[PDB]
């Protein structure tokens, strides 16, 4: 029912301001919240700020002098500018949408790459270890997701990601499975500490998994654990 499509500069000159859109598509919606999040370099997950149905906005605290997120209602769209870039910022930008009223689904976008040429805060840090592993077919498989501190398990996410995709919504609520994802598939944990099991290795389950995280601001993801298969 909803699509969004990032658009912009692809380069961008230090000191700059960094301008993006997000286009949002198909059914009209009563609630909830349209969120910048980009990727750098490596692949870590950076949660910027979003904007709700009532126009408040959140921002990460690293980024909170720079940045504004701004709509245009009328238009469908939803604006992210970011002020003095530097070569930190270089990442894919992704917009996402997301409705508390309904925790099992999460829309993202395809991603726009943007390449470069204030306020004080705290985060929960989510360790992903390890950050590569290789497992055969058919093998059982268990990734961990390790919380600097507690989170609350309703609010403990996880993604799947393939290369040239944008991170999908596998796990919500530490152990409820998403639309689309096989019921080989489970999660489990609490507190600080939380794990993704795969009961029967496929081919197709190669890929990123990372942990999320928003019992606390600003939210936050894991490293990430990339799965890959064995045998060549
Ligand atoms: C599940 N990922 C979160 C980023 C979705 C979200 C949750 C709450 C909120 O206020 C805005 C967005």
């Known amino acids: 029912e909803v699509q969004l499509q990032e658009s912009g500069p692809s380069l961008v000159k230090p000191s700059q301001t960094l301008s993006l859109t997000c286009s949002v598509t198909?059914?009209?919606?009563?609630?909830?919240?349209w969120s910048w999040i980009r990727q750098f370099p490596g692949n870590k997950l950076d949660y910027m700020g979003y904007?709700?149905?009532?126009?408040?906005?959140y921002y990460n605290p690293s980024l909170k002098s720079r940045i504004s997120i701004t709509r245009d209602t009328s238009k469908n769209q939803v604006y992210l500018q970011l002020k003095s870039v530097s070569s930190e910022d270089t990442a894919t930008y992704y917009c996402?949408?997301?409705?508390?009223?309904?925790?099992?689904?999460?829309?993202w976008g395809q991603g726009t790459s943007v390449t470069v040429s204030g306020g004080g805060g705290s985060q929960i840090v989510l360790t992903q270890s390890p950050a590569i592993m290789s497992a055969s077919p058919g093998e059982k498989v268990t990734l961990t997701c390790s919380a600097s501190?507690?989170?609350?398990?309703?609010?403990l996410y996880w993604y799947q990601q393939k290369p040239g995709s944008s991170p999908k919504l596998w796990i919500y609520?530490?152990?409820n499975l998403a639309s689309g994802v096989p019921a080989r598939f489970s999660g489990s944990g609490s507190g600080t500490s939380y794990s993704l099991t795969i009961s029967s290795m496929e081919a197709e389950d190669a890929a990123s998994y990372f942990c999320?995280?928003?019992?606390?601001?600003?939210?936050?993801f894991g490293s990430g654990t990339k799965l890959e298969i064995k045998r060549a």
């Open positions: 996402s949408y997301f409705d508390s009223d309904d925790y099992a689904m999460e829309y």
């Open positions: 198909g059914d009209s919606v009563t609630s909830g919240y």
């Open positions: 904007i709700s149905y009532r126009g408040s906005t």
């Open positions: 501190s507690s989170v609350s398990s309703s609010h």
């Open positions: 609520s530490t152990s």
């Open positions: 999320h995280q928003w019992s606390s601001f600003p939210f936050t």
